[PDB]
Amino acid sequence: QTFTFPDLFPLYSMLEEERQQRQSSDPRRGGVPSWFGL
Amino acid sequence: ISRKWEKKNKIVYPPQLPGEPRRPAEIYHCRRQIKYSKDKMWYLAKLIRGMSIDQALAQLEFNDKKGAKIIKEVLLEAQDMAVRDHNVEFRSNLYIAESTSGRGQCLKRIRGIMEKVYCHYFVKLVEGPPPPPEPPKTAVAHAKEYIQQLRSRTIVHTL
């Protein structure tokens, strides 16, 4: 007979949905907060 | 362990008036626990103590000392945070106002106690051209000072 060892082992929603909503800092704004609509 | 140098970048000055000189930007940076002696890094710190950032970077990139690379890294980081975080429009418009080294938390090893030496590098950059060096006093300054000394003498110990 023959034996080989078998190949065993073959809350986040809001975090991930805000992870695609970085809206990273725009270089041309130069530090001014983007929140204001002015 | 005291960490004031970090806190020195959180000072919010009140907004200025139109008829008031523009307050130059002030940036404080440091690196802690560098595997180097404070005595050796004092030389590198002193070398760059009134230089522009570009001159300091040029000098450090061609120093053979170990602490040169570390100070160069600290200076580049300071330049980045100056332009980005502290509203300094020009990278070039900085100079090393302050550059010192302190001792860190040194370790003790058994050989025969020997000290594994650490240190901190502290820098402060200010926006603008480096201040011109103080000119060496002329003979006219010397003579003026001497004449003033002669003029300031009083009849001692009398009415």
UniProtKB/Swiss-Prot annotation, chain A:
Region ranges (Disordered): 6-38
Compartments, record wording: Mitochondrion
Compositionally biased residues, Basic and acidic residues: 16-29
Bilayer-spanning residue ranges: none
Family: Belongs to the universal ribosomal protein uL23 family.
Subunit structure, interactors included: Component of the mitochondrial large ribosomal subunit (mt-LSU). Mature mammalian 55S mitochondrial ribosomes consist of a small (28S) and a large (39S) subunit. The 28S small subunit contains a 12S ribosomal RNA (12S mt-rRNA) and 30 different proteins. The 39S large subunit contains a 16S rRNA (16S mt-rRNA), a copy of mitochondrial valine transfer RNA (mt-tRNA(Val)), which plays an integral structural role, and 52 different proteins.
Protein name: Large ribosomal subunit protein uL23m
Biological source species: Homo sapiens (Human)
Part of the full-length chain shown: 103 to 153 of 153
Swiss-Prot record, chain B:
Residues of the full protein shown: 41 to 206 of 206
Record family assignment: Belongs to the universal ribosomal protein uL22 family.
Ribonucleoprotein listed as a keyword: yes
Subunit structure: Component of the mitochondrial large ribosomal subunit (mt-LSU). Mature mammalian 55S mitochondrial ribosomes consist of a small (28S) and a large (39S) subunit. The 28S small subunit contains a 12S ribosomal RNA (12S mt-rRNA) and 30 different proteins. The 39S large subunit contains a 16S rRNA (16S mt-rRNA), a copy of mitochondrial valine transfer RNA (mt-tRNA(Val)), which plays an integral structural role, and 52 different proteins.
Compartments reported by the entry: Mitochondrion
Protein name: Large ribosomal subunit protein uL22m
A GO molecular-function annotation: RNA binding
GO biological process, one term: translation
A GO CC annotation given for this chain: mitochondrial large ribosomal subunit
Main localization, broad class: mitochondrion
Record keywords, A-Z: Mitochondrion, Ribonucleoprotein, Ribosomal protein, Transit peptide
